[PDB]
Amino acid sequence: RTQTGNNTTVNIIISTVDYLLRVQESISDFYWYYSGKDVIDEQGQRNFSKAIQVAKQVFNTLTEYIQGPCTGNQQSLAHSRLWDAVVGFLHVFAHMQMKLSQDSSQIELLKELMDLQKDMVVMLLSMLEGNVVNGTIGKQMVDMLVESSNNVEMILKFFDMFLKLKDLTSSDTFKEYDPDGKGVISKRDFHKAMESHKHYTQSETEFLLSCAETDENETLDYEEFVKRFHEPAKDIGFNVA
């Protein structure tokens, strides 16, 4: 952050934040390119993968900068343009999660994106590390959250929807539609099971039907379904909470 002895000082921390802002702007532009299109082609998925990996490395560099209550670095990020990048990333996360989850060819991209979100939340937690009551860092974070309110609401509804899924699956009323331990259930059985569950509304139910990949046998593996969705939600939502 500050080279005390040297004649001239360069803020490597601020430069890292600036690069994070540029890369998140590029990622947002590429997502806006792919927003209207129904499916993302192989080249688009590869470019997203490379960009997400770069952003993940930058987030790790920032969290290693700020961990070990480095108060100077924490204040530097608080006063930097980090919040705008976090806001853009929150919009990207809130929309791309809904877009990719329905498609069954973007599982790898969804995993990469959900890991990037976890690293971002870890960076925010390291920001709050060593907090004080009524601190400027907390003020700026709640300002950022209020600015990105709608995207946070979308992410939090997504997480709650995929967190109730494990309770639904472990419910006995589901294991009577699946009496034997085959682990495979039909589309109609899944739909009427979630209707008997009554904790999922019609919109949540139809979204979960759409996010479910079925074969010509009309039956899917709910074990792999919950393994795919509950675990990322469980690990990211705990850090969010």
Curated annotation (Swiss-Prot):
PTM summary from the entry reads: Channel activity is modulated by phosphorylation. Phosphorylation is increased in failing heart, leading to calcium leaks and increased cytoplasmic Ca(2+) levels.
Outline the inducing conditions: By TGFB1.
Q: Where in the cell is it found?
A: Sarcoplasmic reticulum membrane
Expression across tissues is: Detected in heart muscle (at protein level). Heart muscle, brain (cerebellum and hippocampus) and placenta.
Give the consequence of mutating residue 88 to A: Changed ryanodine-sensitive calcium-release channel activity characterized by increased sensitivity to cytosolic calcium activation
Q: What does this protein do?
A: Cytosolic calcium-activated calcium channel that mediates the release of Ca(2+) from the sarcoplasmic reticulum into the cytosol and thereby plays a key role in triggering cardiac muscle contraction. Aberrant channel activation can lead to cardiac arrhythmia. In cardiac myocytes, calcium release is triggered by increased Ca(2+) cytosolic levels due to activation of the L-type calcium channel CACNA1C. The calcium channel activity is modulated by formation of heterotetramers with RYR3. Required for cellular calcium ion homeostasis. Required for embryonic heart development.
Clinical disorder? Ventricular tachycardia, catecholaminergic polymorphic, 1, with or without atrial dysfunction and/or dilated cardiomyopathy: An arrhythmogenic disorder characterized by stress-induced, bidirectional ventricular tachycardia that may degenerate into cardiac arrest and cause sudden death. Patients present with recurrent syncope, seizures, or sudden death after physical activity or emotional stress. CPVT1 inheritance is autosomal dominant. Ventricular arrhythmias due to cardiac ryanodine receptor calcium release deficiency syndrome: An autosomal dominant arrhythmogenic disorder characterized by syncope, cardiac arrest and/or sudden unexpected death, often in association with physical exertion or acute emotional stress. Patients who survive manifest polymorphic ventricular tachycardia and ventricular fibrillation. Unlike typical catecholaminergic ventricular tachycardia, arrhythmias are not reproducible on exercise stress testing or adrenaline challenge.
Family per record: Belongs to the ryanodine receptor (TC 1.A.3.1) family. RYR2 subfamily.
Can you quote the domain comment?
The calcium release channel activity resides in the C-terminal region while the remaining part of the protein resides in the cytoplasm.
Self-association and partners: Homotetramer. Can also form heterotetramers with RYR1 and RYR3. Interacts with FKBP1A and FKBP1B; these interactions may stabilize the channel in its closed state and prevent Ca(2+) leaks. Interacts with CALM and S100A1; these interactions regulate channel activity. Identified in a complex composed of RYR2, FKBP1B, PKA catalytic subunit, PRKAR2A, AKAP6, and the protein phosphatases PP2A and PP1. Interacts directly with FKBP1B, PKA, PP1 and PP2A. Interacts with SELENON. In cardiac muscles, identified in a complex, composed of FSD2, CMYA5 and RYR2.
Q: What is this protein called?
A: Ryanodine receptor 2
Species name for this entry?
Answer: Homo sapiens
Q: Lineage from the top down?
A: Eukaryota, Metazoa, Chordata, Craniata, Vertebrata
Q: Which residues of the whole protein does the chain here span?
A: 3859 to 4099 of 4967
